[PDB]
């Protein structure tokens with residue numbers, strides 16, 4: 001890649017997917033079927049925008065079509081959750097699923113096994129608030145998840161290309177921290193802090209992926225045709 | 236605390252001196268393979284718990300927090316250690332010096348072959364990156380402190396201390412500033428995949444429990460109850 | 464393969 | 473809680 005650090009950020013920020021709305025009605029109270037219908041409907045529409053966001057991620061179109069499917073199948077719920085955590089940053093104690101859908105930790109109890117996932121998503125958003133995560137770093141992390149969560153489950157030149165694109169986003173992250181006025185020791189620490197949250201996002205995705213399979217078998221609310229294909233990829 | 240006042244060279248020596256031993260096994264049928272791995276993991280957990288106390292800054296925490304961190308990281312720590320032993324054995328996993336299995340030997344257990352491929356790819360990644368033992372003990376102590384911390388300010392101060400020691404190792408090795416934080420990112424991104432293997436491995440154990448392929452020890456059972 | 468189709472635009 | 477017993481020797 002030839003995109004400089006300032007051009008790397010601009011491309012990622014320009015590719016930011018929209019913030020979709022939900023058909024939630026504040027007059028209608030919540031239930032497990034009502035809530036799971038809204039979240040899966042929202043996640044299904046955000047998928048089609050992520051698929052087009054992935055194409056704009058620098059270096060992603062250079063990969064083969066089969067590799068592009070693998071990276072998305074494994075990291076899609078990771079990208080959805082980190083985007084959710086990023087939107088709920090300035091809304092403590094709540095998860096901003098949609099501009100008209102603020103959910104509490106107590107509201108998340110209307111679905112079985114959902115309260116434990118709300119806490120981790122809440123704690124992750126509280127973590128971004130402590131670090132005061134910037135949008136320039138958020139678009140870098142979200143593109144890292146896309147190119148990292150599935151590169152191990154793999155051709156050597158394609159993996160070589162991914163490792164070169166990942167090193168570019170790393171230098172881009174360090175460049176942002178340098179211009180932000182952080183010492184050479186603080187840039188390494190913040191970089192490490194930003195990469196360790198990616199371990200928790202993988203965990204939230206796994207339990208979130210594991211939770212989606214329970215609803216499918218319980219058949220509480222039917223799942224989308226696209227959302228079900230992603231679910232069979234993991235289990 | 237004591238961990239905070241440590242030196243990057245003194246932090247590395249404290250981690251190398253606390254390294255748990257490489258235990259031995261007691262690989263044909265299904266129940267005989269799951270029995271050897273759960274027996275091996277149960278004895279390894281005892282050393283890991285004592286290894287945890289010797290990790291600088293871990294004993295400063297409360298007992299409940301020590302329980303939490305170990306309960307959500309024990310399989311990650313077991314796996315990154317297994318991945319480290321299997322580094323000089325490409326295509327094979329060195330569970331024990333007498334228990335060395337390859338890819339097809341994992342097929343003797345229902346669903347184990349999928350975890351084998353992720354474990355082998357991780358050891359191939361360590362081999363490709365030429366991971367150092369001083370870096371390995373740092374990555375292992377990061378997992379112990381980071382995997383359960385979002386469920387506090389002292390842990391993040393100790394984690395930053397381990398980051399400086401990681402940079403200290405690469406700096407004294409001759410890597411430029413760009414090579415230092417580029418390799419730093421490559422190590423920490425593996426922790427995302429090690430967390431993935433732990434989760435899929437955690438459900439495999441829970442699957443083996445419900446299928447009752449082999450009896451599990453009470454200690455290993457408690458560590459499995461902290462998940463799901 | 465919906466993902467493969469949507470990626471093939 | 474066996475883990476509690478092993479953490480304090």
Ligand SMILES: O/N=C\c1cc(-c2ccc(O)cc2)ccc1O
Nearest residue numbers: 039043080081084117208211212
């Ligand atoms: O699994 N069932 C529902 C579920 C949905 C989400 C989710 C996360 C982010 C997002 O933009 C849209 C939806 C997160 C966790 C979940 O458990």
Ligand SMILES: O/N=C\c1cc(-c2ccc(O)cc2)ccc1O
Nearest residue numbers: 272276313314317350436439440
């Ligand atoms: O899940 N059930 C068994 C299982 C056990 C191990 C394991 C890994 C490392 C180790 O030192 C000892 C044991 C790894 C993967 C597994 O799937």
